[PDB]
Amino acid sequence: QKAAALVDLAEDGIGLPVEILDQSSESARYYFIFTRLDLIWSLNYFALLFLNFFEQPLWCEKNPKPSCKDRDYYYLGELPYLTNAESIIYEVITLAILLVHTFFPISYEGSRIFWTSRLNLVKVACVVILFVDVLVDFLFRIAPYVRVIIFILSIRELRDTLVLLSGMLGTYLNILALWMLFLLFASWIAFVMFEDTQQGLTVFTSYGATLYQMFILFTTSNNPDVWIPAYKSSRWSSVFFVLYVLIGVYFVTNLILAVVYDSFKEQLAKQVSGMDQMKRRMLEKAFGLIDSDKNGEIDKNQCIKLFEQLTNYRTLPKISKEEFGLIFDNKDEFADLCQAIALRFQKEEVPSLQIYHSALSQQLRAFVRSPNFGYAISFILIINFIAVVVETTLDIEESSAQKPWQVAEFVFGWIYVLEMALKIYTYGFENYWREGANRFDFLVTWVIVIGETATFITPFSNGEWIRYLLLARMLRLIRLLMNVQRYRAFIATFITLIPSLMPYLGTIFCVLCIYCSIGVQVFGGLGNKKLFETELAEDDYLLFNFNDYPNGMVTLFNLLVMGNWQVWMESYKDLTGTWWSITYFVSFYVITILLLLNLVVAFVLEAFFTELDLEEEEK
Amino acid sequence: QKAAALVDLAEDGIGLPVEILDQSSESARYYFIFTRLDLIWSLNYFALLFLNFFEQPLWCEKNPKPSCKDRDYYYLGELPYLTNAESIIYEVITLAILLVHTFFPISYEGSRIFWTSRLNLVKVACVVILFVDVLVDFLFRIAPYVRVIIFILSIRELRDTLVLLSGMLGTYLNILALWMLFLLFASWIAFVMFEDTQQGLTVFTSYGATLYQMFILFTTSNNPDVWIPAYKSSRWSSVFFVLYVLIGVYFVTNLILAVVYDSFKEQLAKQVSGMDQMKRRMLEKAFGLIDSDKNGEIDKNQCIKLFEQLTNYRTLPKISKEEFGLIFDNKDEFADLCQAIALRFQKEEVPSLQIYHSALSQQLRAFVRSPNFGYAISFILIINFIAVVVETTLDIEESSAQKPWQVAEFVFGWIYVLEMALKIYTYGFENYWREGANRFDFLVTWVIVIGETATFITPFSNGEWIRYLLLARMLRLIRLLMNVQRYRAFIATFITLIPSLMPYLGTIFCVLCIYCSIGVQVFGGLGNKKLFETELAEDDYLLFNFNDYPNGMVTLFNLLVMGNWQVWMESYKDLTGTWWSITYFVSFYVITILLLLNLVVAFVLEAFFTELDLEEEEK
Numbered sequence A, B: 001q002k003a004a005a006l007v008d009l010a011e012d013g014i015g016l017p018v019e020i021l022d023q024s025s026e027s028a029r030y031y032f033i034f035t036r037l038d039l040i041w042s043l044n045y046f047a048l049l050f051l052n053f054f055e056q057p058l059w060c061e062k063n064p065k066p067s068c069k070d071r072d073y074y075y076l077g078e079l080p081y082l083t084n085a086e087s088i089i090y091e092v093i094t095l096a097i098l099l100v101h102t103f104f105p106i107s108y109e110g111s112r113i114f115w116t117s118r119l120n121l122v123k124v125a126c127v128v129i130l131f132v133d134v135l136v137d138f139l140f141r142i143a144p145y146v147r148v149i150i151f152i153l154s155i156r157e158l159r160d161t162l163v164l165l166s167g168m169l170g171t172y173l174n175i176l177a178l179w180m181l182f183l184l185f186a187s188w189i190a191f192v193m194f195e196d197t198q199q200g201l202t203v204f205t206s207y208g209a210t211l212y213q214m215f216i217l218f219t220t221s222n223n224p225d226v227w228i229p230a231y232k233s234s235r236w237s238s239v240f241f242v243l244y245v246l247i248g249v250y251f252v253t254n255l256i257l258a259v260v261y262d263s264f265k266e267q268l269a270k271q272v273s274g275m276d277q278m279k280r281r282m283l284e285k286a287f288g289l290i291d292s293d294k295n296g297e298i299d300k301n302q303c304i305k306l307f308e309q310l311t312n313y314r315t316l317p318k319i320s321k322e323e324f325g326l327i328f329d330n331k332d333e334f335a336d337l338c339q340a341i342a343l344r345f346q347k348e349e350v351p352s353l354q355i356y357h358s359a360l361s362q363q364l365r366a367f368v369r370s371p372n373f374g375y376a377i378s379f380i381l382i383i384n385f386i387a388v389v390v391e392t393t394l395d396i397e398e399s400s401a402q403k404p405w406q407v408a409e410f411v412f413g414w415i416y417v418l419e420m421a422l423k424i425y426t427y428g429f430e431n432y433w434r435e436g437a438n439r440f441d442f443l444v445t446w447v448i449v450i451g452e453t454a455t456f457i458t459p460f461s462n463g464e465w466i467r468y469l470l471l472a473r474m475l476r477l478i479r480l481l482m483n484v485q486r487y488r489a490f491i492a493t494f495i496t497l498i499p500s501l502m503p504y505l506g507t508i509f510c511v512l513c514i515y516c517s518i519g520v521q522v523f524g525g526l527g528n529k530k531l532f533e534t535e536l537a538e539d540d541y542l543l544f545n546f547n548d549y550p551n552g553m554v555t556l557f558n559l560l561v562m563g564n565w566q567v568w569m570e571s572y573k574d575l576t577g578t579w580w581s582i583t584y585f586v587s588f589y590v591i592t593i594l595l596l597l598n599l600v601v602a603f604v605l606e607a608f609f610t611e612l613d614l615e616e617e618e619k
């Protein structure tokens, strides 16, 4: 419908999808049908992108290919790894399925328009660097790097997040320079102080070592341990370090975050503003198609229809009458009107789903929308909680009475696949997928049903571990505490934080994956027998990894939490012998600790502060 | 002057002193003269309060008074300590000088008014608990506690800061309860997971130990070390802890600060608002005395005088004329007028200082206010910097040529005592004390001159260490970088942070002093010979303190930076044997790490954010 090309586009303004094709000459118009089918394609790609990115943890390492002992607990590792005969198939498969997706934009874009767009040219550019590796691998250095790189821009949420980092990255280098001058100047005054004293052994390499130590003391990871010989020479030596750590942590390290916070708050206001201009680009598009006379304004009889399919197709406002004209007695105004319909009149109605009779289903559908059903599943999870605490508490007692209660938990898992099956049937798959909590339950109910088929066709620890975890589907009981006025902002922020922090937690995560590809290449060994035991002992327990990519992934996490992080840096230094290997650890800290982790803090607070002004606005 | 009782009070509104005596029937009026002399009394008390608070570090410990070996390196300590024969004198002296100060309010207050005021009654209450100890000490448990307690409220800046904590302390307990439930619930799911596995040795005491470990992992101080047996049993064990540390640090620990931030921002808006009502209480007081007719408004001829002694006594606006009435052609309006005079017309003029001739001094005074003098001392510190870097760099070379340059640094110290003596003479001691940088230099110039008298009457390390440090008087060269538009907000915040963070850094500091008095009493020993070596080894190097109050003060700092903090908590646990000694460490963390240190972060950012909107306002 000529009028429906705009109502559907008005709900696209409220729902906020993003596409940039101006002309186009549900059902709208031609360019839309070129892109419309991408949705199933996008859903199937979703699995491909995940597996493409994971082809690097499951990848076979590069240092085992030469000498010496092949696939041993020596130079430790723990995953399935890979055989290239079984590797290239996935390279070929993931690549081929990928290439269909990267050139699919030309369907809805122009031929030259696709090639000239900076997004699609780099997309195909990393698409051409992964094909050459595959051909050469068939008959390996920067091959995993394009996996994560083609992954970070394969998703828009990670892409706009990386762009947000760019605008604030410039001011971040200038404060790092001042941070460097502080470390530089503080290292100087510290070294001269302790050249004619006993701590000349810690300042033996002098400024080169004393800057390295004042740098880790800036992280306080070695606070009582780095200046303990000086504190043994004179008690008044501590006066310097409490002075330094004070300024270093409470003055320096604090206002560093205050920079990111403001720079992040600025760039986020830049992103949502351009998001508004983009959203209005569809709203002005919809209006521009119903204003045929180009005068800039629409008539009554020309807008009574636009409301008429807005009240029917999308949301529930009112009913049209002959009193329509009784209530009666521009381009930029229509956008505000639908945005006002978007907050009050808007409650996205059910899409279809049938060639079927409502009769037999009509019973179940009304009794399931009743609030008493919401209380029923609630009490079912309460009686499930007191049930789970008994099965688990009978494992610790080791009494064999853990068995009868643990099979009753399986019947609880059947209550929820019933609940999943009856609720998706009584609301529609799209309405059931609209709310965030129901998407979760669906995929966690489906991790139970694949467990049931597996656990019972396969044949305790085969069933206890795989099922007792999914009591996490009883975690929406925490929404109860939002009724308490105190904890409302806390839980409501946290709940709204879990998804909103995920694009930022996936970005910092991809950094480790680039970093782990580097650590694998540069640190393949570990002189494995005399340098391993001399370097670390209590920390050799810690440095039992980073010879494997998952081992490297968990140890970058240990460096990401910064818990005894310097024991990896100081060791891999003397495992390589040169001071230039600690740069990998200095570059890590600067890029993720002083930057990415400082960023996610400002996001949480700003998200919490936005939750405050929101609950303040309702009253 | 009847008119001058109000202009001086109007500058008290702009300068913001605080006193609460309504009637009073420089020179103002009777109640003021009762308080006016307190200024010299307050300056002398300033030294008394400092020494009173320090009578606890220099205090002789309590566990050495019984057995066994008296004053040995055994159960280690390092300060001068105390002999009670030489202790009580300072008790008697500090007490007697104190009591004069605590009852001095009755001079300007009413007799019943002093006794009924909650401030003065508790002031005298801790004044009566310190007198009983002194009498009994002459012929000891809660005696140091009233030192810090009578100190935290002896200064208004620490007092209003403690009050700011009170309004936000209530909501802090409720989030601690949710933090406790997270630790509780996470400890549960963690223990049941690892009861039938190898990590049953770390979860040997089960929930009691696993909560204790998940609590320290929440601090990440033992991140790679606490779950290393589980990661050795299965690689998929790390999936749980990365999940937990993620939520624990990035979700939980973050929004905890977001609470303090908002609660701190609220209570700070409460403090400055009541500060404004208090400031206006003097402004409405000054107006109320020049409005004799009580109608609420003042005449021209009645306000032309008030401006006439405002332009003469305090600041420089304009000149009165017969054109005064040519420019011409209420209570709440007059306050805004002087506050507008306070930002534009206001530039606090020089107080007197003489019975002397300006003649011989009139030369030096005009040549020192010239900008070329500011460039002269600037180049003098630049040539001082390149001078200091050579003397120090000749100590490291150990060449005897360090001597001639190091005596030339003494002549630099004479340039600055000259600069101090000529500048205080050409501006007045009060103008020289008005600016914050000049107060600093004065006291650091005076730490040089006491060094000169000492260093030369006493007779290298006797002179190098005591003088090369005071190159810190060349630190105002950092104000240069404020000319660079990038680093302006950074340095300007930092400079405005150093004093503004001091009342908050003194508050957290006094907490350690209460806490150290506790650690001394409860932990006097260290079974010193078998439990010391079995408890800690690498950490016995760390646990070489907390048997002395300064030793306890530096180790609470080590716990304050949270660097390997659990090694003190876990040890003093098995040094006492009971789990209830770790509460001292849990109570510490909660009170200062999750509360006070989270607070000083919000202050820095808010101070930095206020510096941003300030530099934005000038343009």
Ligand SMILES: COc1ccc([C@@H]2N[C@@H](C(=O)O)Cc3c2[nH]c2ccccc32)cc1CN1CCN(c2ccccc2F)CC1
Binding pocket: A184, A185, A188, B389, B393
């Ligand atoms: C690594 O090599 C150096 C060794 C000593 C010094 C100075 N020598 C010291 C002394 O004499 O006290 C300490 C000190 C210096 N400058 C200061 C300024 C303020 C406070 C302390 C100092 C500078 C450098 C730096 N070079 C060489 C290396 N470069 C450099 C290296 C990496 C990144 C950026 C850089 F640019 C450029 C300049």
Ligand SMILES: COc1ccc([C@@H]2N[C@@H](C(=O)O)Cc3c2[nH]c2ccccc32)cc1CN1CCN(c2ccccc2F)CC1
Binding pocket: A389, A393, B184, B185, B188
């Ligand atoms: C210290 O003693 C206990 C031992 C076990 C439990 C519970 N037993 C566990 C189980 O069976 O899994 C773990 C668990 C419980 N409750 C939960 C709620 C949510 C998640 C996990 C749990 C409770 C307590 C607490 N008592 C006794 C001690 N008190 C208590 C002690 C200090 C401060 C405040 C308090 F109030 C009051 C209630």
Ligand SMILES: [Ca+2]
Binding pocket: A087, A137, A140, A143
């Ligand atoms: Ca390959």
Ligand SMILES: [Ca+2]
Binding pocket: A196, B395, B460, B461, B464
């Ligand atoms: Ca020396």
Ligand SMILES: [Ca+2]
Binding pocket: A290, A291, A292, A293, A294, A295, A297, A298, A299, A302
């Ligand atoms: Ca029209």
Ligand SMILES: [Ca+2]
Binding pocket: A396, B195, B200
């Ligand atoms: Ca057991």
Ligand SMILES: [Ca+2]
Binding pocket: A541, A542, A543, A544, A545, A555, A558, B224
């Ligand atoms: Ca490890």
Ligand SMILES: [Ca+2]
Binding pocket: B087, B137, B140, B143
């Ligand atoms: Ca005493």
Ligand SMILES: [Ca+2]
Binding pocket: A395, A460, A461, A464, B196
């Ligand atoms: Ca089991």
Ligand SMILES: [Ca+2]
Binding pocket: B290, B291, B292, B293, B294, B295, B297, B298, B299, B302
């Ligand atoms: Ca009047």
Ligand SMILES: [Ca+2]
Binding pocket: A195, A200, B396
């Ligand atoms: Ca030397």
Ligand SMILES: [Ca+2]
Binding pocket: A224, B541, B542, B543, B544, B545, B555, B558
């Ligand atoms: Ca120590």
